[PDB]
Write a protein that binds this DNA or RNA. Sequence first.
RNA 1: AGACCUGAGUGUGGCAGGACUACCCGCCGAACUUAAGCAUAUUACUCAGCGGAGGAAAAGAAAACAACCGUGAUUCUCUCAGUGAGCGGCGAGCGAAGAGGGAACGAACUCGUUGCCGAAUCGGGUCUUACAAGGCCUUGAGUUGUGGCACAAAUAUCAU
RNA 2: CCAAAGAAGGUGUUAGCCCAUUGAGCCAUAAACCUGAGCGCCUCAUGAACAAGCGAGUAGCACUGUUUGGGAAUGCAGUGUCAAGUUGGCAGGUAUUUGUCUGCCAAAGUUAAAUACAGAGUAGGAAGACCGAUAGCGAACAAGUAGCGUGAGCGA
RNA 3: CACGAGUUGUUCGGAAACUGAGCACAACGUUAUAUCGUUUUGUUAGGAAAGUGAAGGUGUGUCGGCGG
RNA 4: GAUGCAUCCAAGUGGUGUAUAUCGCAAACUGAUUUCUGCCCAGUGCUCUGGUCAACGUGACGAGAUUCACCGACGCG
RNA 5: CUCGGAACGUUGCUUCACUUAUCGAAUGAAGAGACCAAUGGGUUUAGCGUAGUCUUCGGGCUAUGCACCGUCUAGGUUUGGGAGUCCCCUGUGGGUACCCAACCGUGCUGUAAACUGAACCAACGGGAUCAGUUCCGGAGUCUUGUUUCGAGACACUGCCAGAUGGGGAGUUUGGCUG
RNA 6: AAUUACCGAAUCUUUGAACGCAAACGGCGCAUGGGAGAAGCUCGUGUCAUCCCCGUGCAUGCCAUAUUCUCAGUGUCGAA
Lengths: 203, 96, 211, 255
Amino acid sequence: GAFMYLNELWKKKSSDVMRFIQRIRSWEFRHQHTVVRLRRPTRPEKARMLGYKTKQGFCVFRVRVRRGGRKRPVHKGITYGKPKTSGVLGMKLNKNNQAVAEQRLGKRFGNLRVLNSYWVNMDSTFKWYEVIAVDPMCKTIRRDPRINWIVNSVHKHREQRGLTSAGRKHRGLRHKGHKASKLRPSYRAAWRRNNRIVFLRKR
Amino acid sequence: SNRVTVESKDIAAFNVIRYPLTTDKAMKKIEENNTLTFIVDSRANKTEIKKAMRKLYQVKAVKVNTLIRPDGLKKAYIRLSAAHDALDTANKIGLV
Amino acid sequence: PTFVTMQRKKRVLQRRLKVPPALNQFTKVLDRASRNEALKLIKKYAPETRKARRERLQKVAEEKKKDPKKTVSTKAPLAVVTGLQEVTRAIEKKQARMVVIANNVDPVELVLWMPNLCRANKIPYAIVKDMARLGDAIGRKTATCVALTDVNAEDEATLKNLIRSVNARFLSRSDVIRRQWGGLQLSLRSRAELRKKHARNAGVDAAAIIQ
Amino acid sequence: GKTVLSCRKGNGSVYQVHGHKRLGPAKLRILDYAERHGYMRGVVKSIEHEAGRGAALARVEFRHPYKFRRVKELMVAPEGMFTGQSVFCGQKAPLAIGNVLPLGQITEGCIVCNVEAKPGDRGTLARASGDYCIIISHNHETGRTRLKLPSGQKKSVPSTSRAMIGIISGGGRIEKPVLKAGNSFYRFRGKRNCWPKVRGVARNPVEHPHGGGNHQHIGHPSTVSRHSPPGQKVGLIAARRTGRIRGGKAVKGAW
RNA sequence: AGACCUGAGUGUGGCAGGACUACCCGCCGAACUUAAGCAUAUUACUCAGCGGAGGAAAAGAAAACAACCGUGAUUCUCUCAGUGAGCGGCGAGCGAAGAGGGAACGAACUCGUUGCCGAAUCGGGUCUUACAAGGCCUUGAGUUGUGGCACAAAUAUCAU
RNA sequence: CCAAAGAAGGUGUUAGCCCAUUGAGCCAUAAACCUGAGCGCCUCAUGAACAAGCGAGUAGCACUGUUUGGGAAUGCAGUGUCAAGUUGGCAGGUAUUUGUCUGCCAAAGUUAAAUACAGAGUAGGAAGACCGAUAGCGAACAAGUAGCGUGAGCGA
RNA sequence: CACGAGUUGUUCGGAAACUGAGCACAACGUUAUAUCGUUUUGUUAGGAAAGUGAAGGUGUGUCGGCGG
RNA sequence: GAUGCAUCCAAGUGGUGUAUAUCGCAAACUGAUUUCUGCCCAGUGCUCUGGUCAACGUGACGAGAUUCACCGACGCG
RNA sequence: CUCGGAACGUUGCUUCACUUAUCGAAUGAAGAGACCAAUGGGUUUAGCGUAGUCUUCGGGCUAUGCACCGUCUAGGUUUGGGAGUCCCCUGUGGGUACCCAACCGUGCUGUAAACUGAACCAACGGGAUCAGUUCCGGAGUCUUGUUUCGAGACACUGCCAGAUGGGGAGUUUGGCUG
RNA sequence: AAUUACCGAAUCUUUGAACGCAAACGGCGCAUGGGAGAAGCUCGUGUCAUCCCCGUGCAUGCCAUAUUCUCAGUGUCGAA
Ligand SMILES: [K+]
Ligand SMILES: [K+]
Ligand SMILES: [K+]
Ligand SMILES: [K+]
Ligand SMILES: [K+]
Ligand SMILES: [K+]
Ligand SMILES: [K+]
Ligand SMILES: [K+]
Ligand SMILES: [K+]
Ligand SMILES: [K+]
Ligand SMILES: [K+]
Ligand SMILES: [K+]
Ligand SMILES: [K+]
Ligand SMILES: [K+]
Ligand SMILES: [K+]
Ligand SMILES: [K+]
Ligand SMILES: [K+]
Ligand SMILES: [Mg+2]
Ligand SMILES: [Mg+2]
Ligand SMILES: [Mg+2]
Ligand SMILES: [Mg+2]
Ligand SMILES: [Mg+2]
Ligand SMILES: [Mg+2]
Ligand SMILES: [Mg+2]
Ligand SMILES: [Mg+2]
Ligand SMILES: [Mg+2]
Ligand SMILES: [Mg+2]
Ligand SMILES: [Mg+2]
Ligand SMILES: [Mg+2]
Ligand SMILES: [Mg+2]
Ligand SMILES: [Mg+2]
Ligand SMILES: [Mg+2]
Ligand SMILES: [Mg+2]
Ligand SMILES: [Mg+2]
Ligand SMILES: [Mg+2]
Ligand SMILES: [Mg+2]
Ligand SMILES: [Mg+2]
Ligand SMILES: [Mg+2]
Ligand SMILES: [Mg+2]
Ligand SMILES: [Mg+2]
Ligand SMILES: [Mg+2]
Ligand SMILES: [Mg+2]
Ligand SMILES: [Mg+2]
Ligand SMILES: [Mg+2]
Ligand SMILES: [Mg+2]
Ligand SMILES: [Mg+2]
Ligand SMILES: [Mg+2]
Ligand SMILES: [Mg+2]
Ligand SMILES: [Mg+2]
Ligand code: NA
Ligand code: NA
Ligand code: NA
Ligand code: NA
Ligand code: NA
Ligand code: NA
Ligand code: NA
Ligand code: NA
Ligand code: NA
Ligand code: NA
Ligand code: NA
Ligand code: NA
Ligand code: NA
Ligand code: NA
């Protein structure tokens, strides 16, 4: 189908034609807002893959995040304590930019449920992700068996708890077995299991 | 309308005017200044007190002077028209 | 307004930059006369409306209830193939006699590959001016592409002439299309400045030639 | 240690400008079509003093080029400007003192003020009292005019930038001795919180690199590097030389 | 004229906002302390800080272990094991996993894709005792794709 | 004298029989819940037999930071660079280049139970080899009260 | 200490209803994090923040004027 | 001489001197007149002209990891 | 061993020209550029040729013409053409001294020593249906588009690398001992 | 018509996320309904200017929507 052709075209991201398209798009995005509502996704194939449907109640927002590593927000770069915890510029956030963009969108628009997001463009200073959101109060959403689940309360602000795909990625849930033994079900849960002192009754 | 409770227009002045005062100064003003002293609603208007006197005691108030007491109540000095006897209206109210 | 400024500057940038052939091929659209003729044919073979389809299905149901033994075909009357998935399937199966692709689809990657697929499968294809005009032809708001798979005997000659005129522009010029780069177009003020500069320096170096 | 005063002044706070009683920015009129093609005539209505400035300001009334109204610009007056004077601003303005002309229309060797570093900049050079630039030469190939600035430097600017003819008023303010800390107090009252000045050697080691010691001295050389961090760059910053200048003053500034 | 693309204004119908916060999920994150000093280390992926849910949360249906005569989503317990694993100024210290006995368990499903269909879809009116998983209508949305059928627990579905 | 009841509360001393309790049962119920997936009716669904694909700025890889028992790198983050799919990929706890074997098929999503409640609530219960009014909660009492501090707070 | 009283405004003071040094809601940016920044040198915001109306259309009421 | 100098700030189309413009801003020292301020650039600063110093590149041996050569700026000399 | 060239593709630097990214200004984004015409653009402004060279025979593609887009001006200077002083009383009042072309010019009604006047909400003229009722110009037109100006692919943005760096952070600064 | 207990129906001042706008102000709006009106008019009767009173709506963002609402763009076409 046409999906195969769009998928291969978007796998060829370093070609001349795709570089031209992405440069024009990056200029246009650079001259817009941080969060922009769109009628249709820029990549319909990727959006449909990640959960978007051309139905009433589905929304797409393009969110912009600045690129680069984290700076520790200490006054004048002054830190007190051991020299180990003294770096101000070389530290890195333990959360990826896709998760940051999803969280910014979800915190800005609290009446929507964030479902997924995908990379569309990046330039020397910015990075753009399209975030799929669902309206929980729409009859089309509330009567569809395949998106019904997002209306429940356990899914409120899932992007803030890191339950989206990018959240799982930076939590390490992409791995199983010996690669994620201390990270499952979460690192806090594993720490609790491993560090709680157990007092059996008769011992 | 999102407010559905039944509110009666004929009982509004009973809330505006609560009870009269029978202190020495209040009774002193009745005889000479044609003035009745009342305790009224603390959020009430002088115009609303003037209307409430007409609706309740069928008298015309030419002047109303209100003060909020140091204990939080509101006290109104209502001077009746010269056509009305403040002593007669006080007798009708039930204070003497 | 910012959106006005950006929509004008986007066109300016697209003209000023160097456009690779894959994107530049959509600038060289079919001519006006053949575009009007193709839209006339597409509108003649437009898909049936919701009401028309519903009445046809109701009549089919009545013909079924008249006697269950007789089987009535529920196939729709012959029409154009409309929709990205259906047109792609028609091209891939080589069922399409002639494909029409709008040049102003954004995202362009929906139809950027379609001329190459049509060329590879040897199906005649034309690039036309508006998905809005295609949608007006087919009864919708817009249309990325439309495929003519078959026509009636009355329209066979029109389809053949359209195929020839379309192949004149698109299928027979494949070598030029695959290699022609676009863009690099100067502004009017820049062209005027260059012309005046050349006029000023027209004969400064006349005394350096021996003759 | 504690923060140095030169770095504390960068926070603003109580070290900002005393802008109350000031009339506003003193600029040339906008570079509009009338200035770029013909000229505009305005009338000097009043000459006034602004707190914190040593030169006089001129309120010049022009007509609006597009509307039925009057504009009333406020500029720095050149010396000799009087009330009722006619000021011509544009390409076709005559070469007279107080007129604003493009730098390409002014003869070489002319003394100008309120010079624009960029076209449309509305004047940023030679604006202190008694100061002026000298037009050295024009270059019609590149369209640029060379000027000698009040500091003695030479600067090339686009010839479309405008300039007022004459020197800035109030010249000779610095030749009168102040004689009194009270006079200095009143002088700086309209400028900002920068006076009196405490010497670094008179402070403690916690606040200043120069402070401390049983004798009032700078322990280390007072010439500091250009790459010194803030709080360390105090004293003579990136000095190419020191001591009493002999045999001729050089032109201060970068090359 | 007109379209449709992008973007406004208004009407109409909604929702977000704060509290709580024991537990749980995401970030951010010390130091006292211990090393008889101290900088790696330790405390501790802890306190404090900032978000977000729920009666639980998270996890969860193999890109899993293993190396067997093999096992079979997740979670938890005993055990493995303070370990002849490992990590560590190899110092002070730190430190898991598979297997086994159990608890639980009707435990599995959905989409994109690919084939074959193609508006059969969704809202909105109106009607049926019905804001029906129903009929009828509707350009309103959608062909820049909504919905159906079949993909291993599989071997057609579609009539009548 | 009672006990299918001895149950431990009250009552002017230490109560099975002074009182209340201590049991079968009985009566009454918005919805939900449970019951030949309780059972009719209308409506609406619906069961059985009559060839190609499979998730790309992704996975890698480099550098830097961090985290881990994970050690020529257990996860993750930044930035650079960036696949395969016709020795297809991934894992197999010493880096490399091979070539064999085994298990599995990443980069959408949902999912109950067994588990937590380490300074929460709501409506109830059962208690205790606990404390006994300088104790046990700060608070057995008009206690976060009176009072104190500009305030954050502190607090009988 | 107990008990009972006492404060009356068209014009007084404030507000309605001015501007100042200033502040910081919106907006926009930033931040893992808004509980951060900017926000008067005429003055928000890449920024479509005017709902108000000079004429003249047309009706209605109040005039004068013309002829009949 | 403003795409400046000093300097705030975790950050931004962020902030201060600067509503400024060298008779100006910013940073030091000495301390009213008056009379003067000698010699020293070795040291240590500061400043201005032509061996070594990183990453990155570039090539090569090798199955490859690895390695080696070359190039390489402030700075220092 | 060294040196000389092609004639190719590619490319490491780099001059110069440019402009669209980007940067610096200014402005209420208030008048940019052209018309004065390419080393320009159109087969929805590519029409007509010519010569190659292709073709899916429908047409292209390279050159190279010609045509179109696409034009109007203050003023200066000189070339042609036509064509209408009078009242009252010497004074006063009212009026006429045109058009066309070319070339220059380049958007141009004002000043050039200054010494404080006023200017808004159009007069008016055409064309259609005295006055309506509309148009139109008065008050040029155009747009390969950019608010304008200055820079401009460097310096502006990330990341990696090295210097320097008490400006600041942490720590330490043995023992024995008349 | 006891009183207790329990609860299905009612009430529920001023605030506060607090949201018409402010605020050491029991302040001030704008719509849209009411109410009371001792001037005036009308015939104590109606009606009622100014005034005073009360209810409801009116923050911002987002989403959906418009019997298919009103617009903007030297965006793309298409008429003309
Ligand atoms: K960042
Ligand atoms: K630090
Ligand atoms: K486990
Ligand atoms: K001072
Ligand atoms: K110790
Ligand atoms: K740790
Ligand atoms: K087991
Ligand atoms: K007892
Ligand atoms: K294998
Ligand atoms: K889940
Ligand atoms: K738990
Ligand atoms: K509990
Ligand atoms: K003396
Ligand atoms: K020296
Ligand atoms: K060197
Ligand atoms: K420019
Ligand atoms: K338009
Ligand atoms: Mg971090
Ligand atoms: Mg898990
Ligand atoms: Mg009073
Ligand atoms: Mg001292
Ligand atoms: Mg110091
Ligand atoms: Mg001294
Ligand atoms: Mg000294
Ligand atoms: Mg905490
Ligand atoms: Mg549970
Ligand atoms: Mg869950
Ligand atoms: Mg540890
Ligand atoms: Mg689908
Ligand atoms: Mg049954
Ligand atoms: Mg039944
Ligand atoms: Mg990657
Ligand atoms: Mg660690
Ligand atoms: Mg560790
Ligand atoms: Mg897969
Ligand atoms: Mg017990
Ligand atoms: Mg006691
Ligand atoms: Mg106690
Ligand atoms: Mg106590
Ligand atoms: Mg007392
Ligand atoms: Mg007063
Ligand atoms: Mg102010
Ligand atoms: Mg400011
Ligand atoms: Mg002296
Ligand atoms: Mg000396
Ligand atoms: Mg031809
Ligand atoms: Mg041709
Ligand atoms: Mg050609
Ligand atoms: Mg409020
Ligand atoms: Na200021
Ligand atoms: Na010292
Ligand atoms: Na909340
Ligand atoms: Na087990
Ligand atoms: Na018992
Ligand atoms: Na000195
Ligand atoms: Na002194
Ligand atoms: Na001094
Ligand atoms: Na020396
Ligand atoms: Na070297
Ligand atoms: Na401008
Ligand atoms: Na240091
Ligand atoms: Na120190
Ligand atoms: Na110390």
